[PDB]
Ligand binder design. Structure first.
Ligand SMILES: *Cc1cc2c(cc1C)nc1c(=O)[nH]c(=O)nc-1n2C[C@H](O)[C@H](O)[C@H](O)COP(=O)(O)OP(=O)(O)OC[C@H]1O[C@@H](n2cnc3c(N)ncnc32)[C@H](O)[C@@H]1O
Ligand SMILES: *Cc1cc2c(cc1C)nc1c(=O)[nH]c(=O)nc-1n2C[C@H](O)[C@H](O)[C@H](O)COP(=O)(O)OP(=O)(O)OC[C@H]1O[C@@H](n2cnc3c(N)ncnc32)[C@H](O)[C@@H]1O
Ligand SMILES: CCc1ccc(CCOc2ccc(C[C@H]3SC(=O)NC3=O)cc2)nc1
Ligand SMILES: CCc1ccc(CCOc2ccc(C[C@H]3SC(=O)NC3=O)cc2)nc1
Lengths: 494, 499
């Protein structure tokens, strides 16, 4: 019944918040709707796969909070395989390459591609990470979709196809679904185009040995019986001295403060007394999550490596079910596997099929792209469609349709009386990722410590020392990349 | 706790559904979250106003279901005042006019305005009322906002300005917030541009004597103790032979079937066992309601009539808090009043002020638009910001952002095991309105009667005889309206002769 703080949600953010408060000497309780912890992370274990991340998996340089938390819990990382060549498959042909950038051979098309990525980062430099609505052109950019921006910027269909894939893969949503301002903020707050797309020296550099689900699991181990599973919160009452929190299974909890560590829209599943302020009331109806099926096909051997391919495939176009893959083989070289994402509208379309039907489509696609009949002989298959999850709403994260971020963005982390807001969606660096989940959970926890008079105001937001295990190398550009003209810039010189 | 059908929501749609089922001999229960029925309709009564609709109010020709239901319940309508001139206020100046269309004198501007409304209706004719996602260019149109479509179509700032106000006023949302396909559907399913904008011969022709809240109240009277107030539904369980419905105040109800008669996104407030199918699970996170404050300023007399103004003002410009007003005086001629809407972003922006501050801003605006110092002397004020409502989510209705209607639209009224879906959002004619609430409630009820083997399949969807009290004049166009060129059409003709 009685405690200092109730945390709603036992994903990484809620767990990180509860741990910090617990370590500080407060009595905490975590109320989790599911029969498991981890939320948008989920590590499946069976003999065929050993373990596999069906939700969030990747960590990399500059994500120092998640790396520090995992290390403390006794976890280690290994590198996602990028020794051999990456593949860009365009108009029915595979083009192997090295470096983070797919090569472009046509000179006009080259200028167009170069300008697109450069312009994304140029625009990002004017968007504050902690307040994107304060961008000088916030309203102009928020009132446009990414489709509109791409249509204006890309003079070649080639650039437009890759730019579209980029949007789809970053935020599991269609270019026409999302605000340009929000999307440009999203990329900038991960460190820019190069950092977000990169395996080596980027967001996809590493995975956790044994799976990312261990983060939430091991914190639940540390919290004893303070984690309550199968307790979906249904009601929060702030009319009295202590806050009252009621669960679906009829239990009542009493606390001084609450942390909401669930996706913003899932706040709708809770009935509030008194009602929420107008702006939050409407905000939580305006913020959907994206759509994705994560699919892992297993093979006897990582056969692609013999052809000097690392397993990374970037696959343009409408026909392909999967637009992007990475090698999911274990560090020992066993449990050979390819991870692929079925993105946005394709998640919706292909959900109608059977598991076996999807397996066949993926195997035939991979056989074409890798140029190998070995892709047609899988030994095992696992997948998860995150669109079906009542207590997630989708994956990877929440996207903002046009007009929403400028009108409602401010209220995302604004406290409501004694309710404070965590969740990766409220982070200012790697929001959308496990890193942002840690940042937001610890910040929300420290807001409460400050409310209790335990720490000063300047300690609410705290820097993180760089990981020694996963250090970051700087992102560089070339002289030509910085100074080559766009297509219309070349036209104006003519 | 045992019944045949549980209806979730006691707005017009749930009440219409419950009444039909009750009349058919079934045992119904209505579970309503609030301490009142009516939902997005709410009639305030006090001595200063007598009565006033703070939510949905207007009915008109072609809305035959709401008119028939209200008539059966003993209600009467009266006509909104449109005897005198309307006002279009643009660039700080007022232009009085008659007819549904603000006058446009500049011939280029006239062609552009004519073509804009014509094209809205032309495109609408391509969109099936019962399946907008089946339009030939559904995907192209759904992947565009209304802002993009206006930018393409309007060759004058004058047309773009009025078109923007039109969207804001129809759906309480910004042009950049909404899908072009969805908005084009929304207008077409109300009968088109002329019908949706008109007072005389359109959606705003009439109000109910005594207020629209009487519709839901009188149905509650008919149903007696079957309506349960302050029972917000939290949980629906379909894993066993009969459906189990749990409320916040700790009550359990058992039923053969359920009708969900709440705004689609408010489905999120219910925990489902088993979980909803993927498409509905995501759909209910993708469908917000609009933003509006409805404001009524009272005066000693309807002084605007003396200057040959009916009370209708169409007000363009960022600075104006209210973009549209109608005379709200009682049919007897007393309790003189102006009704105004604060729309979309302005509802958000102006919510920060006090009630007294909003009243001052409205009076100052009305004084300028009407050229009348008497507008600075209000005797009373009432208002309601629908953005603050936990159990509405907004008003008037649900809008669809770009890309959503084609991807998720088909599941809006698709049954989920033994749950059937009512609510105005699921209607095919005047969706968003009290009329659509009746259509959807009665249709959902008949879906259940069919499932029980009580009526044949062809009786699920039923036509409605035209009101004898509110006849519908047809929507007509002139030869010139049909065949005058667009601005680019004129330019093509110019470039053709110059050869
Ligand atoms: C789904 C997904 C996510 C993902 C990704 C691929 C997929 C398919 N790949 C990632 C990656 O490679 N690297 C990375 O860093 N992130 C990746 N992501 C996203 C990542 O998983 C998320 O950013 C992160 O997991 C989010 O953490 P957070 O703690 O903020 O949120 P959550 O996991 O959703 O946890 C919320 C918990 O709350 C519970 N819940 C929901 N409603 C209630 C109620 N009413 N009462 C009590 N509890 C509730 C949820 O069940 C959940 O456990
Ligand atoms: C708000 C508004 C609406 C409006 C308008 C002006 C404003 C300011 N002008 C209109 C007009 O002039 N003419 C017209 O025909 N319509 C106008 N509108 C729209 C109109 O009010 C709506 O279309 C109509 O009232 C909607 O009816 P419907 O029955 O479909 O929906 P509802 O009124 O919202 O009723 C839903 C009920 O369900 C209850 N609820 C919500 N959640 C729960 C849960 N969890 N459990 C139990 N009950 C629940 C709500 O409280 C409500 O009563
Ligand atoms: C800047 C030039 C460029 C343009 C597009 C691509 C194709 C690959 O793009 C990517 C885009 C996003 C991501 C990150 C994706 S992958 C994941 O697990 N989670 C993510 O957020 C990974 C790769 N490569 C290079
Ligand atoms: C076709 C040419 C034209 C273009 C716009 C206007 C300005 C008025 O536009 C209107 C637009 C919508 C509405 C209906 C609004 S008012 C209400 O109570 N609920 C509604 O849906 C009423 C008027 N007049 C004429």
């Amino acid at each position: 019944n009685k405690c200092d703080v109730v945390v709603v949600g036992g994903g990484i953010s809620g767990m990180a918040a509860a741990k910090l408060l617990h370590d500080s000497g407060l009595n905490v309780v975590v109320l989790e709707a599911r029969d498991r912890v981890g939320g948008r992370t989920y590590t499946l274990r069976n003999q065929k796969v050993k373990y596999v991340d069906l939700g969030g998996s990747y960590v990399g340089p500059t994500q120092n909070r998640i790396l520090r938390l995992a290390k403390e819990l006794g976890l280690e990382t290994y590198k996602v395989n990028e020794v051999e060549r990456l593949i860009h498959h365009v108009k029915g042909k595979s083009y192997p390459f090295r470096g983070p950038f797919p090569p472009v051979w046509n000179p006009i098309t080259y200028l167009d591609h170069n300008n697109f990525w450069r312009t994304m980062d140029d625009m990002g430099r004017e968007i504050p990470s902690d307040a994107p609505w304060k961008a000088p052109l916030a309203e102009e950019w928020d009132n446009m979709t990414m489709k509109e921006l791409l249509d204006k910027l890309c003079w070649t269909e080639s650039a437009k196809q890759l730019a579209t894939l980029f949007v789809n893969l970053c935020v599991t949503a269609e270019t026409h679904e999302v605000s340009a301002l929000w999307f440009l903020w999203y990329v900038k707050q991960c460190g820019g185009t190069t950092r977000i797309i990169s395996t080596t020296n980027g967001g996809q550099e590493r995975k956790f040995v044994g799976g990312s689900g261990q983060v939430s699991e091991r914190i639940m181990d540390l919290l004893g019986d303070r984690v309550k599973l199968e307790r979906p919160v249904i009601y929060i009452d702030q009319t009295r001295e202590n806050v009252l929190v009621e669960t679906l299974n009829h239990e009542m909890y009493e606390a001084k403060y609450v942390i909401s560590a669930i996706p913003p829209t899932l706040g709708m599943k809770i009935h509030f007394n008194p009602p929420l302020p107008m702006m939050r009331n409407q905000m939580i109806t305006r913020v959907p999550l994206g759509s994705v099926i994560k699919c892992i096909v297993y093979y006897k051997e990582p056969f692609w490596r013999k052809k000097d391919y690392c397993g990374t495939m970037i696959i343009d176009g409408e026909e392909a079910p999967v637009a992007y893959t990475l090698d999911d083989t274990k560090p020992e070289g066993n449990y050979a596997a390819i991870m692929g994402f079925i993105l946005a509208h394709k998640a919706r379309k292909l959900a109608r099929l059977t598991k076996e039907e999807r397996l066949k489509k993926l195997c035939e696609l991979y056989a074409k792209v890798l140029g190998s009949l070995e892709a047609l002989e899988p030994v095992h298959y696992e997948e998860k469609n995150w669109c079906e999850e009542q207590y997630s709403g989708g994956c990877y994260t929440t996207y903002f349709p046009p007009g929403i971020l400028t009108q409602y963005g401010r209220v995302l982390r604004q406290p409501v009386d004694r309710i404070y807001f965590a969740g990766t969606e409220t982070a200012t660096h790697w929001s959308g990722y496990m890193e942002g989940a840690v940042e937001a959970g610890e910040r929300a926890a420290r807001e409460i410590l400050h409310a209790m008079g335990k720490i000063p105001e300047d300690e609410i937001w705290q820097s993180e020392p760089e990981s020694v295990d996963v250090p970051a190398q700087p992102i560089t550009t070339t002289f030509l990349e910085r100074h080559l003209p766009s297509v219309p810039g070349l036209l104006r010189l003519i």
